[PDB]
Structure formats: C-alpha cells, structure tokens
C-alpha cells in the first residue's frame, strides 16, 4: 500500500510590480530556474519524454522568501545557487532516478552574505566563484568561493541598493554590479577590485535593473534600467562605447531585463509590454513582439534567451511567454499561480490562490477577477464554477452575483448547487452557488471556524468550546451536538459521503472520527499530527463501505487514515512546503493536493 | 462499406479590411450565422450535444460570394436569408435528422434585387418582410415580401452605397438605412416610404457602417460609422436625440458594428480593437475589453449580442471573441481559416490556406507568417512543421529558412525530411524540409504540373505530352517514363506507400493506376469523373496488400477506388463546395478532407 508522486504542476515565477525577476536557463537540461515564495524551482521545457525530471523543488531557504536561482555554468553539474530576503545564499544540487526513482536535493553549502535581501547572484564561468548582491548593512554585495565562502574581492562604489551583477564568462575576468541612483561599477579580478564607476550614463534616481556581458569573449557589457536607456560598455576596459538606440524603435517603458541570444544579439524587456531583440553592432531593433499595453499584467519583468534564437519572457501576471527570433508570433504561453493555493476542485480541475487568482486547467484559463483569498470553488454545474473570496464577493464564472455584508471566513459546497458560508459576524449562510441568492441563515452561538456541507447536513466547528454542531440543511432551527469536542479550535470538518461519519481535525493536529447518527466517537486512534489539519477527503469506491480518508496538514504531510483499521496509515511526507492546503480524490485511486508552496500535485494510491 | 460524415470544422466569418461583417445570432438555437466564400454557415454555439446540427452550410449562391446571412426572427422557423455580390437574395430553410446526421437545405425563394453587391439584410419581426440593401446601378435597396418578392415600399434618399439597414422589430413599423457620405435615412410603413433624411450628424464623406433599433418597443435607433460618432435617434419619429459619448471613454477608432444586449445597453466594436458596452440612458461606457492595438488583425469588424450578457466580437483576422458583461476577461477565442484550404497534414492536424494562413489544430495556434498560398506542409519532424508558399519562401515553425529564386508551383514531402519542389522555371529541387537547404536539382525538359515524393522516387507530371517521369531520389540523373501518358495535363500524383503503384489523375477527371516497377498501367478501369483531380491518398492497413485509394475532385466529390475491384467505388458526394482540395487518412478507418470552401471534414470509412 502506498502513495507515490505522479505529477507536479509547479507555480509560475514570483513577481513584483516595478521589480525585476532574474531568470536562469540551462542548455544541457533545457530547463529554467526561478523563485516562488520560499522555494526555488527548476522546470524542464522539454516535451514528450526526456531523462530530465519535469520539476525539481528546493525548500532549503526555510522561512525566507527566495529572490533568485541560478544554474551553475558547468554542464551536467546539476548544481545551482539561490539567495533569499534574509541575505542567505545557498549552493545545492539534485539527482534523479536511482534506487528511489525520485528527485533528491542536497545543500552543498550556505553562507550568510548580507543583512538585508539578496537581489542577484552570478557564477563565474568555472562555476566555483560567486558574486552575491543586494542590500545589507554598509555592504551591498560580495565575491566569495562557492565552497568555503571566503572573500575573493570586494563590492564597492555603491551608496545604495545593488540590483544586478554579472561576471564576464571568460578570462581576463571582469565584473559589473548595477543599482539604484543610476549607479554602475566595473571590476577586474580575481581578486575582484573596484575598477571604475559610472553615474553619468544612467539618470540619477533611476533604477538600473539588469546587466550582462556578451557570450564567448565578452567584448561587450550592457546595462539597462527604469530610465529606459540601454548602455553599452567595453567588456574588458569597462569604457562607455555608446547607447543602443534605434530611431525607428523608441523604448517607451522602463526596462527590467536583458539576455544575450549570442555574441551579437540580445533581448530587452520592460514596462511597455514589449520584447525587443537588438543587434549591438548596428544598434538596430531587428525583432520585437508586443502585448496589449492596457493590461497591467502584460508588463515584462524578466527575460532569458534559451539558445538558437529562442526567448522566454516573464509577464507581471506571472505568465511565461515563448518567442523565437524570425517568427513574428508568440509560440505559446504558460500561466498559473505564484501565490499559495487556498481552494481546489476536481473534475474539472480548478484552483484558486490567496491573491484571488483562479486557474481553469481544462482550458488553461487564468482569471484575476477576485482580488483576495479564494475561500471556495464549486464546479457542480456543467461548464460553470462558483467562487467565494475574502474580497467579499461570490462570483459565477467570474461575475459578481453576491456581495457579502460580512467577510466570509470559510465555506463548503455540496453537489446540489448550494454553499454554506461562515462570516466574521458569526452567521451561517446557505447560498445558491450559481445564482448568489442567500436562501436561509442563522446566527451561530459563537464564532465558527470550519464547515462541511453534505447533501442533508451542515457541520460547524464552534470556537467557544471547540464543539461541532450539525444542522439540517432543510431547517437550520434543527441541530444536534456531537457529544465529544476537539481539544482545540476546529480547523477542518468533513461529513462522509453517505453521511454516516464526520471526520474533524483541529489546529493542534488531532482528528476525531464521529458516527453522525449516534453523534458519538467511533475512533480517536488516528495519529496526532502536532500540526493543524487543513484538509480531509473521503475516498470513493472503485468494498463500497467507507474506510480510507485522505488528510493533509500544516506538517506538509498527507496521511490517509482508515476507519476499519485506525492503526493503518498510508502516508506521503513533505507533500508541500509550509503545508498541504487542499486534498481531493480526482479518481478512486488518485489524489490531488495543493499547498502553501503554490504547487498542485497528483498522486497514485495503491492499496496493493 | 461506406463513407459517413464524422465531423465538420467550419470556416471563420469572411472578412475585409475597412468593411463590416454583419453577424446574425439565433437565441432559440444558440447558433450564429455568417458568410465565407460562396457559402453561408450556421454554427451552433452549443458545447453539449443538442437537437441542433453543429453546422449548416448553404451553397445556393453558386459562383457569387456571399456577403450576409440573417436568421428569421420566428423562433424555430429554421429559415434564413442571405445575399451575395451578384445582388441576389435567397430565402432558404434547413432540416436536421440527428439519427442520420443529415442536413437538408431547401430554397424557398430567390430574388435578383440589385445590379450590384448586397451589403445588408433585415427581416421584419414577423419574418415575412425584408429590407435588402447594398450598391446597385439603379437602386441601393428594396423592401420586399419574403415569398413573392413583390415590393413593399421604396428605398430612397441615398446617392451612395448603403451599408446597412434594420427594421424596427415592432409596430408601428419603421426602418433605417445607413450608408456612405454619412447619410442616414428613416422610413415609416409598411408600405415603407421615406420619412426623413439626416446628413448632418455624421461627417460628410464618412462611412456610416451599422444601425440597429433597440429590442422590444424599439424606443431608440442607433447608427455608428467611421467618423467615430454614436448617434441616437428616437425609434418612432427618427428625430436625433443625442450623441452617445462618455467623457471617460473616448472612441479612438472608426466603429464597425453594434448590437443591443437589451432595451438599455448595446455594444460597439471598431478599428481601435476595443469592445464597448454602453447604456443609452446614462450615455456611459459600462464595460470595455481590449486587444493589442499594435496588431492589425485585432481590429474588430463585427459584433452580436447572444443574450444574457453574452457578446461575440469578430476580429479582422477572422477570430470570434466571446465575452460576458460583468466579467473583465475574455471567455474564449475561436480561430481558423476563411480562405480556401490548400495544404493539409495529419497526426498532428495542420492546415494551410491560399492567403498563407496556417492552423495548428492540436494547440489551436493560428499563424499568419506566410503572405500567400500554402503549397505544402510537412510535419514529419517531431513537434515541428515545414511549410512552402507562393510568397516564395520555405518556413520552419514560421521562420524563413529558404527563399526561392523561382516560385514553387507544387511540392511533396516524404517521411524522411525531404521535399521535392517544382518551380516556375521548370526545375525539380530536392530540399531538406527542416533546414531549407537545396541538396540537389535538375531542369525538367518541360514544365511540371504535379509531384509525388516517396522514400526513393520522385514522380513528376510533365505538361508536354502529359507523361509521368519518375526520378530516383538518390540520383536525379536516373529516370524512366511510365509507358502510358495521361489523357490531359497531370493534376495530382501519388506513389504507393510501398512504392508498388503510382496513381495519377489529370485535369479532365481521368485517373490511371501504374505499376511502378514495370511502369505499365495496372488498371484504367477507375471511373472517369469529368472533373479535375486534386487529391489522391492511399488507405493504410489496420490484409496489408494496398487496395483502397481515396480521391478528391473539383466537382466536390470523394471517390475511394479499388485496385482489386476497379469497378467498386465508395463515394461521398458534395463533400466540399467548389472542390475537395486535400485528402489524408489520419487513421486506417478515418479520412480527412479539406475544400475550396475552407472546411475540414473527418469521415468514417466502414
Ligand atoms: Zn476571469
Ligand atoms: Zn506563426
């Protein structure tokens, strides 16, 4: 009996308005690396079948949000380096398929580089040296060895935050750090030492967002920023050569990033939702692609050349846009979440995060209608879905059908087109999911922290004494109390499909199984989790008797308990970093989970 | 043993830069009607199976391009009226027998109303009267009975082309005709007669492109045009009430169409690639939707309200855009061809048309990289396709990889990454499909009109003597003639998948089967078609012995011949109006066809 990972739908790259998201690409594995929340991801761009893991997730930064992730330049080393807001940089490696037939991530080294957040990281061409930058205390960056962390020079010439850096990928070695107040600094080394600064070519007060030496001999170094200027310097002497400008193509928005496709051409991306490919020698824009400027999410905040004329651009809305020099049309777009997933539905698969974003995976439709945490999703009506959010609205297919007088804390929908909601004013509301009309309501005796709606009942977890009250869906004046209460505030409740049982967990990790009809406890032997229970879902028959119940908690784990054998547990550890939020049976033999890491995972459940 | 229709992928609405495309929608059947080429289509919007046929195709306008198709208002009547460039209006009805999956189209009446082209048509609310408008020598429109064609009034007040009309959908009946030079005319009736003219509210020389009375009581009438003005008139008196303008929402482009959602709100769409919903009373833009203005193809040419807040906008690029009031994001998009299909690939399914448009059905990616007819498509390389066009280029995934010194007339690729091209200068070129490099060539002793490339041979139809010359791929210096020449110019050639036989048809309708090795005719029994042959494709095994051969002809038919029994034929008549252009077996039992009518059809072969 087991639960094995079947598929991982990674999140999109994290993004911030007015900030660049530095991406990374590896030719050998044809993968891109990027941060999202407290994790660093490596996504393979391949299709069909390959030897490369579809996804590699690194959670070693713990409680610190990851800022950047960079592949080592050494082919096949399978090493990477990432930094976080706490100012810590980590060198780690992965391995896939062996005795385990799974991915293994190992920290090779870690150093506390800066006080404040790290903004960018760069490897030397040997993959043994690192230029780490950001904004610490009286120190905005360093040059260190990848293994011991010893200093290999100094970052200087900056009185403000450094936004990007890059090391010439060849001898003689040179470096460039770029930052706020239009500051740019050239270095020679190792040991990397200040060579010259420049604050005349980029407007003062401007944000110089990115820098990169041309490939091969690195004869050129280019810097770009919010002042929409493209500065070209000599890759060895650091002298200013000229601005890259084409009178037939004015840059209309602040630039966020660049990336060379080869030794003569490079792409720039900015707030004007335009991707441009420039030729350094002629200074002409040989290619460009645009998106509707009227949509804030279309701003391009990151970009990376992926070999042979291919380019991947990152939109502010987290979407990855695929282009190819010589083809005037975008090849494809990949969208998704980059914020914790708080709501899930199955058949069809629909997800919602804490920023209000909803994903319709059947049609790859991404929505940004809601503006806050998605409380619940209902897909009981053919081709439609109803969502509730902390923005105080209920929307049907992205259209507001009800405005909440009180913020909905939690909610649960059955299969008949109804949804039970618990508000901040302690009211239990029953709404017609696809019309938005409140059909009936009752004021709870105390605040409610969890609700489960079955065909005929409404189970509510009361914060007063952590008790569970069960109402008749047909008459909210009629209810009964489960004899035994939980030991802490109810966190999640789930009435069995036949309504024979009611599983209920609390914020401590305790889960109790009740016999709905006798309102008595049937078993209290289900292992304590020492962590908040976030999801409970009953397994459907392919024997028809209810038994196995999947559960996820803040302890990142997935425990499938058994009514019949309370001591029998099939589990999958480390399902989601910072906790499994939703869990459902897409199939009698397959589970789908989602977590605070903004990932959605499918699992095969084998009873053997 | 038979061929039955399995699926129909209808074209997109026909479109023209600077012109509006008047769409029609029927609530009762949840379908939309629109023109494309010389056909009128009705596409059901239903996602889940219903009693309504997915597609209805009227081909009665014959050789004349269809310009507008309108549903009758009578719920369930199943009648429609369409007009064409020859100035002919036709009232027709369809019947659908789900079980047989058969659609019957009957012509109720046809009237030659204008000398010139028809631009718009409107039914009265009783579905018994018609306002037909356009650009004629003597008249620009008429008012007639749907059954007798007898006049029910007179169109007047216009000295220039009329672009559209509408009949107030209630008594007292009224009408509005709109046209060039910013002229607007209001009528009363029946008998519909001139009531008042207005060449003051729309700029002189501008094109008033659309007009529509509000639903129900029709208290209002609105006109829109290239001058960017939205003029609101009283539905009963015709008196100008006010310009519909929102200080917070300026119209930055010529308007092409409008459609009332209800009695208070309507939508306008135009050259500024923006769909706007207004409220006549407040005069405010209640909702807006935009597409990237930097792309010509996003200009909006048509629009129609489909009820309950739903709206469909038509892009200049033929794409249908689905929106819904109160939802700031596009629901979905439907793209495709609106020009005859000329190239076809299978597994995955890719199609190309004579405007150079290429569609990747597997991912629903519509391409406009080429600027002219697609001569051929090759999808032999994994996740990639090579296309050759009359724009003189060979592209790989939409990127030019070769520029021809002489225009490619026809081309044929095999499964090994090669393509044989016959140029306008009579050269046979062998190119690597995915690099664009020419690796070998030879000047033919005559112009070539057809090619077939197999693993080892190149079959070429020569226009001089109508002979077939078969070169050895590995050495263009080695070639042999098939003993018997064709009766006429070769039009399509296909070498057997084992290279045992060679099927060849000419522009007259004759197809001959040759034995490649002995270069002798194996059978000349296959029925003559009195119509040029455009396609030949051998059926693959699920005995292995080659036998069935699918063939498409200009006369619209599909004939599957037999090598074993030359007299037996499995046919599918009327597969594509104006001719089946391409045929391929995406499966041993499923034949895929493309036609001059821009449709793609899948057939099951019993
Ligand atoms: Zn939406
Ligand atoms: Zn394209």
Curated annotation (Swiss-Prot), chain A:
Organism: Saccharomyces cerevisiae (strain ATCC 204508 / S288c) (Baker's yeast)
UniProt keyword annotation of GTP-binding present: no
GO molecular function, one term: actin binding
UniProt subcellular location: Cytoplasm, Cytoskeleton; Cytoplasm, Cytoskeleton, Actin patch
The name this protein goes by in its record: Actin-interacting protein 1
Gene behind the chain: AIP1
Pfam families: WD40
Residues the record lists as N-acetylserine modifications: 1
Function: Involved in the depolymerization of actin filaments. Enhances the filament disassembly activity of cofilin and restricts cofilin localization to cortical actin patches.
UniProt KW keywords: Acetylation, Actin-binding, Cytoplasm, Cytoskeleton, Repeat, WD repeat
């Amino acid at each position: 009996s087991s639960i094995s990972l079947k598929e991982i739908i990674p999140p999109q790259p994290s993004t911030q308005r007015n900030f660049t998201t530095h991406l990374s690409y590896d030719p050998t594995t044809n993968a891109i690396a990027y941060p999202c929340g407290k994790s660093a991801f490596v996504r393979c761009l391949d299709d069909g079948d390959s030897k490369v893991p579809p996804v590699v997730q690194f959670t070693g930064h713990g409680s610190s949000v990851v800022t950047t992730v960079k592949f080592s330049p050494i082919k096949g080393s399978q090493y990477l380096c990432s930094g976080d807001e706490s100012g810590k940089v980590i060198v780690w490696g992965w391995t896939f398929d062996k005795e385990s037939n799974s991915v293994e991530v190992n920290v090779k080294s870690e150093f506390q580089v800066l006080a404040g957040p790290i903004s960018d990281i760069s490897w030397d061409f040997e993959g043994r040296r690192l230029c780490v930058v950001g904004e610490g205390r009286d120190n905005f960056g360093v040059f260190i060895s990848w293994d011991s962390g010893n200093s290999l020079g100094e970052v200087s010439g900056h009185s403000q935050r450094i936004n990007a850096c890059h090391l010439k990928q060849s001898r003689p070695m040179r470096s460039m750090t770029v930052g706020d107040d239009g500051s740019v600094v050239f270095y020679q080394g190792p040991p990397f030492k200040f060579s010259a600064s420049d604050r005349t070519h980029h407007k003062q007060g401007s944000f110089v967002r990115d820098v990169e030496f041309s490939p091969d001999s690195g004869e050129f170094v280019i810097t770009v920023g919010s002042d929409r200027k493209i500065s070209c310097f000599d890759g060895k002497s650091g002298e200013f050569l000229k601005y890259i400008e084409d009178d037939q193509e004015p840059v209309q928005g602040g630039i966020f990033a660049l990336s060379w496709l080869d030794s003569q051409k490079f792409a720039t991306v900015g707030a004007d939702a335009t991707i441009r490919v420039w030729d350094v020698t002629t200074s002409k824009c040989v290619q460009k692609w645009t998106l509707d400027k009227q949509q804030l999410g279309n701003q391009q905040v990151g970009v990376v050349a992926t070999g042979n004329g291919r380019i991947i651009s990152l939109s502010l809305d987290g979407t990855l846009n695929f282009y190819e020099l010589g083809h005037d049309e975008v090849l494809k777009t990949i969208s998704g979440h980059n914020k914790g997933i708080t709501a899930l539905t199955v058949n069809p698969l629909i997800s919602g995060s804490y920023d209000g974003r909803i994903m319709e995976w059947s049609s790859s439709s991404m929505h940004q209608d809601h503006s806050n945490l998605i409380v619940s999703l209902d897909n009981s009506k053919a081709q439609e879905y109803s969502s509730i959010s902390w923005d105080d609205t209920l929307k049907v297919n992205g259209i507001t059908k009800h405005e909440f007088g009180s913020q909905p804390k939690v909610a649960s929908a059955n299969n008949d087109g109804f949804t039970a909601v618990l508000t901040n004013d302690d009211d239990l509301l029953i709404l017609q999911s696809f019309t938005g009309d409140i059909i009936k309501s009752v004021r709870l005796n105390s605040p409610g922290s969890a609700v489960s709606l079955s065909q005929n009942y409404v189970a509510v977890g009361l914060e007063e004494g952590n008790t569970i009250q069960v109402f008749k869906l047909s008459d909210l004046e009629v209810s009964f109390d489960l004899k035994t209460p939980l030991r802490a505030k109810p966190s999640y409740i789930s009435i069995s499909p036949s309504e024979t049982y009611i599983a209920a967990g609390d914020v401590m990790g305790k889960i109790l199984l009740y016999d709905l009809q006798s309102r008595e406890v049937k078993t209290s032997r289900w292992a304590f989790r020492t962590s908040k229970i976030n999801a409970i879902s009953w397994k459907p028959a392919e024997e028809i008797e209810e038994d196995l119940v999947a559960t996820g908690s803040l302890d990142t784990n997935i425990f499938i308990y058994s009514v019949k054998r309370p001591m029998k547990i099939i589990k999958a550890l480390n399902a989601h970093k910072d906790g499994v939020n939703n869990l459902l049976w897409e199939t009698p033999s397959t589970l789908v989970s989602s977590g605070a890491d903004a990932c959605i995972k499918r699992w095969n459940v084998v009873l053997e």
